[PDB]
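Hi D.,

Good news: the full-assembly prediction came through. Inputs first.
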Amino acid sequence: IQMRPDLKGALLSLIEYYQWDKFAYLYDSDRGLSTLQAVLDSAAEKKWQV
Amino acid sequence: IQMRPDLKGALLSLIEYYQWDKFAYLYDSDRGLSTLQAVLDSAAEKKWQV
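Then the structure:
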């Protein structure tokens, strides 16, 4: 029973809001690379230079 | 005592051999994302577009 909601969908929608095409993505290998894989899988789809 | 040698250094050297500045990295979250972080950490150090 995961009380924490999924943030991957929220982050991918905020990057699209500001119309970001090239940005840095620091990450900590603590909460898992799940959000990192979400922005990398969409990096090819929406053409981002992450 | 894991008998498998580290492939991260070998792949990072092979990419540097062919002089690859832009390539695709098809990974599976099975053997861990250790090689994926290795090519992503070098993606900014050596200025790749993975």
